[PDB]
């Protein structure tokens, strides 16, 4: 019988489809002049509508790739899989929702890359004595957790410009420790020392040849070093089938963007790779510091897990920084960094436990809702993260996507991807807002009262000035008229008090009991 579609959209095909998912449009054009074209499909079949001329699109979630999740990351012919399905083609008509499930699993024995960023100001000298044997001691500890470990090295002090560095006397530019008995290296901003190597003894060999620097202020500019270690993939050597850890060790504050204006540096950091062939951050004295948002974005794009391994007196500060950069960890470092190995192992455990999802390239007309089927079967509505997992344990996520309105472009794409994992799920969204009968619309047709409107999908659609089944009469002087003859007798009411009179032609209003037709709306 009557429904929402019956009395909501009766003017166009797109208006019919936008009313509700259940609406259908009978674009059959042998139907009499004016009919319930827009209503449910079943009664359109009952209305003797042609089965081939019925516009009824059904939203669906079609999977395109469903490779099975891998059991071991050992052997790894670039074929380990951690997210299934991998590609899904989603087709959504407007004001409708579709749901699909994904399964994320942390494959056992996955290769790992560790890049050791180390602050190297003068108060960080004794640490250099308790790191000289980290390549051999970390290889033994992390051999049980993974079968392919690669380790690198870095350094940084601060920008070498104006009030940060000493420029007097002239003998202090060669070594800033002129006043002290000892001598230090000329001050640098960031120098890449050792690229990610499978050989482990190279870390010991290339860390015994280092030496400290000295700058004036207390904060040290390590955010520049983090950015340059992140965006220079080819120089650093980051793998693609591995877990990226960036162990960033410091014992003082850090410089943030706009803090470089004290040196005369106003150009914003653009987040590109500037480390040359001399292994030195070249644009150090010309570009500002990286802000928190840009640093987070570059960490996200390259799949880096950042570990602030900092001393006690500043731990709180970095904790409050770790709440603004998702995916990081904070660890407590001794004065002489005699416990950085255990810090690294525990932080790796904490990274590997949690599973968190993130959405990339999501457009403004789509909304998503997650239901985490975590351990056992206890769904946790609204949650897109699980904690307290192990190695090899799998979690499931149920996703529901809703669309508001008809998007301009019927071909978009976005990504559902666990944070820190290479593997991602790609959704290709197609919006079915336009029916096929609107493509062959014929304008200025004689079928719309001598080209006074467009004739598509079997219905005249005309603009201002005219209205009706075929845009017959004008409303310029239609209100004052003697064409009141819409009933058999003068004393009788118009349309039997059951419809509206338009230009001397009764149109029956909708009824919940059933359909109303007739010249004077006297039928049922």
């Amino acid at each position, epitope marked *: 019988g009557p429904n929402i579609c019956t009395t909501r959209g009766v003017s166009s095909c797109q208006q019919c489809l936008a009313v509700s998912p259940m609406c259908a449009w009978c674009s059959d*054009e*042998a139907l009499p002049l004016g009919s319930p074209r827009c209503d449910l499909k079943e009664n359109l079949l009952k209305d003797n509508c042609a089965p081939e*001329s019925i516009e009824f699109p059904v939203s669906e979630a079609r999977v395109l790739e469903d490779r099975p999740l891998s059991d071991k990351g050992s052997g790894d012919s670039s074929q380990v899989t951690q997210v299934s399905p991998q590609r899904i083609a989603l087709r959504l008509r407007p004001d409708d929702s579709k749901n699909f499930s994904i399964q994320v699993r942390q494959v056992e024995d996955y290769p790992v890359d560790i890049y050791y960023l180390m602050d190297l100001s003068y108060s960080m000298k004794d640490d250099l004595w308790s790191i000289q044997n980290l390549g051999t001691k970390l290889a033994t500890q992390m051999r049980k957790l993974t079968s392919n470990l690669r380790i690198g090295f870095g350094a940084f002090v601060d920008k070498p410009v104006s009030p940060y560095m000493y420029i007097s006397p002239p003998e202090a530019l060669e070594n800033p420790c002129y006043d002290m008995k000892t001598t230090c290296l000329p001050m640098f901003g960031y120098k890449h020392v050792l690229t990610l190597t499978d050989q482990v003894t190279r870390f010991n060999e290339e860390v015994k040849k280092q030496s400290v620097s000295r700058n004036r202020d207390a904060p040290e500019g390590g955010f520049d070093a983090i950015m340059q270690a992140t965006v220079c993939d080819e120089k650093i050597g980051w793998r693609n089938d591995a877990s990226h850890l960036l162990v960033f060790t410091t014992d003082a504050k850090t410089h943030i963007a706009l803090d470089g204006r004290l040196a005369g540096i106003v150009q914003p950091n653009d987040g590109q790779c500037h480390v040359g062939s001399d292994n030195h951050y070249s644009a150090s004295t010309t570009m500002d510091y990286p802000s928190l948002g840009l640093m987070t974005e570059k960490l996200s794009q390259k799949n880096i897990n950042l570990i602030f391994a900092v001393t006690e007196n500043v731990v709180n500060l970095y904790q409050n920084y770790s709440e603004l950069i998702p995916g990081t960890t904070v660890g407590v470092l001794s004065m002489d960094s005699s416990n950085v190995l255990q810090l690294i192992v525990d932080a790796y455990g904490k990274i590997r436990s949690k599973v968190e999802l993130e959405v990339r390239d999501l457009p403004e007309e789509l909304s998503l809702s997650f239901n985490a089927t975590c351990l056992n079967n206890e769904v946790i509505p609204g949650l897109k993260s699980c904690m307290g997992l192990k190695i090899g344990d799998t979690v499931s996520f149920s996703i529901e996507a809703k669309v508001r309105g008809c998007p301009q472009e019927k071909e978009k794409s976005f990504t559902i991807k666990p944070v820190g994992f290479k593997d991602s799920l790609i959704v290709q969204v197609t919006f079915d807002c336009d029916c096929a009968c609107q493509a*062959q619309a*014929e304008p200025n*047709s*004689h079928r719309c009262n001598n080209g006074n409107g467009t004739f598509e999908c079997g219905v005249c659609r005309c603009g201002p000035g005219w209205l009706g089944s*075929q845009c*017959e009469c004008s409303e310029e002087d239609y209100r004052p008229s003697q064409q009141d003859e819409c009933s058999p007798r003068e004393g009788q009411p118009v349309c039997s008090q059951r419809g509206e009179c338009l230009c001397g032609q009764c149109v029956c209003h909708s009824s919940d009991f059933g359909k109303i037709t007739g*010249k004077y709306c006297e039928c049922d």
Partner: antibody
Framework: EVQLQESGAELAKPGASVKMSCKAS????????MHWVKQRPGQGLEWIGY????????EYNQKFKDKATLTADKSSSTAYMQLSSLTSEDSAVYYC??????????????????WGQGTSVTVSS | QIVLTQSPAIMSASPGEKVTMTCSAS?????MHWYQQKSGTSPKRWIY???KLASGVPARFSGSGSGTSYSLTISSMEAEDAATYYC?????????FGAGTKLELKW
């Protein structure tokens, strides 16, 4: 306008196919549709099919369906109808009728207008 | 499908007489058109929406009625109006034609 011209009589053996033509001269041949009406020799005018010349929307009649396929040629401005699987009971006169728009008698969509001369189809072996 | 039955199958009248034809529908059709086909098998159009004369029709033919039974009236019939008249409905979606009424002349 308006003149519709039909082809001459066709003799067909049972089980064959027929190629009816209706050549339209006048108006535009893209703003008025075309019907096909069968007339048995014992009275009784039967609606057959339908075609919009711009886009081939062929709505068919009471249990005709595959027994008549309608096509159009907008270049030569001519509407064709193909009868398939002929039987001895299909020996009647086939007309092609236009379709009044603009007014189209308020709601009764049908006005036809300008019928063709009528092509008698004779079926025998 | 709506079935249309024209009650008088064969008629005859003298020149200068009143003639009436009836086409009674089966499902309360709004509007009903009448086609005239002479001897020669080519039915023209004669009346549309059951009260309006198509161009070229004289001012003698009239149509009246509503609901389920319509009628066509001829006043002062000459020898030029002797054909078969068919009724069309097209308010359902079979457009069905009437069986037709034959009209003759008295002599």
């Amino acid at each position: 306008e308006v003149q519709l011209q039909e082809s001459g009589a066709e003799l067909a053996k049972p089980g064959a196919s027929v190629k009816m033509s209706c050549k339209a001269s006048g108006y535009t041949f893209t703003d008025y549709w075309m019907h096909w009406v069968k007339q048995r020799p014992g009275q009784g005018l039967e609606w057959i099919g339908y075609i919009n010349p711009s886009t081939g929307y062929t709505e068919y009649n009471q249990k005709f369906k595959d027994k008549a396929t309608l096509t159009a040629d907008k270049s030569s401005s001519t509407a064709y109808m193909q009868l398939s699987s002929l039987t001895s009971e299909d020996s009647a006169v086939y007309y092609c009728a236009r379709w009044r728009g603009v007014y189209r008698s308020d709601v009764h969509y049908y006005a036809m207008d300008y019928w063709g001369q009528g092509t008698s189809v004779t079926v025998s072996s | 499908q709506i079935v249309l039955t024209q009650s008088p199958a064969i008629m005859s009248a003298s020149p200068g007489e009143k003639v009436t034809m009836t086409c009674s529908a089966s499902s309360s059709v709004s509007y009903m058109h009448w086609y005239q086909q002479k001897s020669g098998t080519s039915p023209k159009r004669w009346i549309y929406d059951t009260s309006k004369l198509a161009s070229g029709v004289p001012a003698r033919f009239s149509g009246s009625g509503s609901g389920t039974s319509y009628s066509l009236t001829i006043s002062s019939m000459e020898a030029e109006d002797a054909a078969t008249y068919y009724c069309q409905q097209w308010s359902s979606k079979p457009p069905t034609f009437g069986a037709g009424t034959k009209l003759e002349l008295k002599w």
